[PDB]
Amino acid sequence: MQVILLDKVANLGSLGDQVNVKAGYARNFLVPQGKAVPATKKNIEFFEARRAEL
Amino acid sequence: SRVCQVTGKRPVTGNNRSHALNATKRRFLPNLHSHRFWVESEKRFVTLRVSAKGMRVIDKKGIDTVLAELRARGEKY
RNA sequence: GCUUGACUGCGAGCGUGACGGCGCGAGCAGGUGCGAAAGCAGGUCAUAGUGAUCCGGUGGUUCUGAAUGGAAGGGCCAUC
RNA sequence: UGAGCCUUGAUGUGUAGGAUAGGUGGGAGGCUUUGAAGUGUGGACGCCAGUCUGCAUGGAGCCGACCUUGAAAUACCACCCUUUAAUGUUUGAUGUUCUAACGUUGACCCGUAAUCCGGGUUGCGGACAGUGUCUGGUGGGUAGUUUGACUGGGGCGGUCU
RNA sequence: GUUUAUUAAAAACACAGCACUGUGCAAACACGAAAGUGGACGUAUACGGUGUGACGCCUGCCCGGUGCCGGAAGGUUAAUUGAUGGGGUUAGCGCAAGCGAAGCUCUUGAUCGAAGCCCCGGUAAACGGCGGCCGUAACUAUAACGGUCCUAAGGUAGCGA
RNA sequence: UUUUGUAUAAUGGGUCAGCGACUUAUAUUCUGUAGCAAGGUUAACCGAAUAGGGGAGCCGAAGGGAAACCGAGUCUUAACUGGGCGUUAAGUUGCAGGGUAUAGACCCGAAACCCGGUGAUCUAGCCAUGGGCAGGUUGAAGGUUGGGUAACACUAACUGGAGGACCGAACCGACUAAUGUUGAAAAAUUAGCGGAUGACUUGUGGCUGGGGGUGAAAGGCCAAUCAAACCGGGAGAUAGCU
RNA sequence: AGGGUGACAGCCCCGUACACAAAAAUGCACAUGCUGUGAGCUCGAUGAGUAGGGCGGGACACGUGGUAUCCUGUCUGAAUA
RNA sequence: UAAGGUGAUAUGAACCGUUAUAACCGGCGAUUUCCGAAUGGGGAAACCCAGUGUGUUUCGACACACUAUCAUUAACUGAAUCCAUAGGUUAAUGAGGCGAACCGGGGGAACUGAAACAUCUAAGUACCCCGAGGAAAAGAAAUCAACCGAGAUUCCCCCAG
């Protein structure tokens, strides 16, 4: 779903963009194995500050 | 028991209404599945026998929010 | 030969049925057909040719319209 | 790679006719020296009519009511249609890969002086299997029931308006 | 041997054997909503269902019907997908008769759509079936034989009051 | 009593005494009685408690029409010489009774369905652990030796003791016949008869439960029974039947 | 009121109306103390896998019927005075 | 409160007591064997068998005390796997069972009625199961009303068959 990436994962990733992917690829691979974070409307404002400040 | 641990979905009974509307008793079983959830807070795989609809409830609320509610009503995970 | 009375709304009175119902019926109102006219015609010489009801379909009618204005549905009449 | 979708470019033989004219719009000039017409080939479309275009020769132009056509310019620019091609997004009967769900009545380790169960590691399957919901076929396995009446007893035959 | 305790002890049931079908193990199957157990702590020389009932000679013909196993070009067809068209409501327009946008809603159900059926080929130690009408050998009768009946095919062996 | 019809040899009763069957509640209609009267009457409730208070509401004096609506007229139709239905009669509330409706509904009584419990001390199968099978026969395989053969085969004694083997007690089973039939016994006695080293029999204990069990299969068995056990409950099931 | 006393008792007895009584335990009332709880004003904030919908049912007198509302086994999914 | 009394069938025996220590009635306590939620382990209920701590002019045996399970809280420890968790131990507090109706919730019939019978009715009744109280449940409007308003829930009587 609306998950935001953090890693060099293959061609849907650009070090973090909101994509439209299925929920099966969301959980257990992106929801924690690393490499991403769920977007439960709290991380879309927290990691947005990580984009601007860094 | 076939009970959804999160949303509390328990099986209910109904009728098999055919073309002649003859009533025959049966039951409605939930789409229950045993899914393994990793939490970022406690660093542990949490296994939960939940419904397929209940997995979507976890997706909006968060696994830390769901397991906080199971601690309140005395559920064991 | 000429035509549509196998008319519409009615119907005094009567026959026959336990009942549901069925059958006959002059005449009146409206508008017609035939005849020059008096008149006759609401199917066929008569007696069999039929399916009660529930449920719907079609056409017509603001009759109803669960706040109001419509509408849906229902009823009425015609009909399957 | 098939299909929808969004840009970008090809793309239009009624006929007289400078001539394989898409329609509405802006439009008397844009383009060329940020190096042009017109010849010479390769590839290619195709009603072999002709057009498009890379490379290259080339070394200074091509147009517009121009008179005609029912309707004027490949002078140029716009939203597009017909046809057609290539990238880019979305969605799909078969084949492969990945592991991270899931499966493990495989090994191994621990709770644990435990053939249960639970956790971990690893091998192998794998988004199948299996289950739930919905749905078609099958279904006396099982359950609820019907299977008419007069009648010289009943059944049979026959009858019911 | 077993069986209708308490009217039927058998020609019945069982039986080793035989054949078909199911089944590669987390077996099929069965009890179980499920877990689990049985099968089995067994692995096709095994297990389950069914049929027949030692042994001896053997078990013919027929795949249409009814079942099952397949092969599939097409037809039809469920959930789902919701393409078109119609209706209701009314902003606005028409001095009126009426028409009618968007929105929402009702109704209609093209396409996508697997098994099954239609279709074709097998299977009878599957359920079954192995004839109806005629003609023909001394008198009848019978039919070795020969036609018809388009129903898939018309009693082989042995036996027979 | 039931019948067209019973002394009827159709049914019921040995007798005696006690007990025992058309009720009750709420509605509705009618009759009688009583009150008031174009009005009658309250229910819940209040209460110095059946009063008193409470008129919420019901019924009736107006109906016709599907209805809007109209109205002593209305409806039908374009309109009726008319017609369908009404107007011109006083009802209402108590009480008792005759009926109906719903409840078990005059009483007695089914065979059965369903639910919840209880039973495998009987019987059926199975598991676990023990016990019993007197006696008399038949003499397989194998072992051994001899004859015989080129060598096997074959055969002869001895030895061996195989068997859902035979005869037959205890034990188990119950085929024929009699007695017994208000028995000694809700299936036995007596005399014959079958099995009896097994697919045996039995003690002890456990497991399998009602649409289920078990079943060498009779639709048998499952506490003197089984085409669905027993007990309790729905339940006073229902009964057009006696 | 009633019951008993040798047959039917106002005046025989137990009682009755009435007047009283609790050391100890205990129910219920207020009065009051203590330990926790929390007032009022002002400024905000307004309950999301939820409402709804596809489907399968059930409950509302109301059997899917033109059928609203309520509940949910399944799938999907908002708006923000 | 008392001059009588030692419950009754049911006498007798033996005394007690008569002005406050007979008996009788009431309040508060003590003892309260064994079984039963039964709770130290078990068991065919009213029986058997331990662990630890404590007491002996006889420190054998007996007497005394305590030790069930679950959940919560807290402390101490503790794997695979380093930290961590799973797990283990101890302590504190609470629950267990019975009991006639009534309540709430989860499951849920059939006879019968329809003169048969499947929709339906019987009926969410009978029964089962969980949980709780003296009541429970419900309860302060995303409710009705209809352009006037009313203002939670529950019960009764009407509306009304």
Swiss-Prot record, chain A:
One cellular-component annotation, GO: cytoplasm
MF annotations from Gene Ontology: large ribosomal subunit rRNA binding; structural constituent of ribosome
Transmembrane spans: none
Keyword Iron in annotation: no
GO BP of this protein: cytoplasmic translation
Superkingdom classification of source: Bacteria
Keywords, ordered alphabetically: Acetylation, Ribonucleoprotein, Ribosomal protein, RNA-binding, rRNA-binding
Self-association and partners: Part of the 50S ribosomal subunit. In stalled/collided disomes (pairs of ribosomes where the leading ribosome is stalled and a second ribosome has collided with it) bL9 in the collided ribosome contacts bS6 and uL2, while it contacts only helices of the 16S rRNA in the stalled ribosome; the inter-ribosome bridge thus formed is different from that formed between normally translating ribosomes.
Biological role stated in the UniProt entry: One of the primary rRNA binding proteins, it binds very close to the 3' end of the 23S rRNA.
Sequence similarity: Belongs to the bacterial ribosomal protein bL9 family.
Protein name: Large ribosomal subunit protein bL9
From Swiss-Prot, chain B:
GO BP annotations listed: cytoplasmic translation; ribosomal large subunit assembly
Disulphide bridges: none
UniProt cross-references to Pfam families, sorted A to Z: Ribosomal_L28 (PF00830)
Lineage top rank: taxon: Bacteria
GO cellular component terms given for this protein: cytoplasm; cytosol; cytosolic large ribosomal subunit
Gene3D superfamilies (UniProt xref): Ribosomal protein L28/L24
Keyword list, A-Z: Ribonucleoprotein, Ribosomal protein, RNA-binding, rRNA-binding
InterPro entries: Ribosomal_bL28, Ribosomal_bL28/bL31-like_sf, Ribosomal_bL28_bact-type, Ribosomal_bL28_sf
GO MF annotations, alphabetized: rRNA binding; structural constituent of ribosome
Family: Belongs to the bacterial ribosomal protein bL28 family.
Subunit organization: Part of the 50S ribosomal subunit.
Record-given protein name: Large ribosomal subunit protein bL28
Natural source organism: Escherichia coli (strain K12)
Lineage: Bacteria, Pseudomonadati, Pseudomonadota, Gammaproteobacteria, Enterobacterales
Encoding gene, per UniProt annotation: rpmB
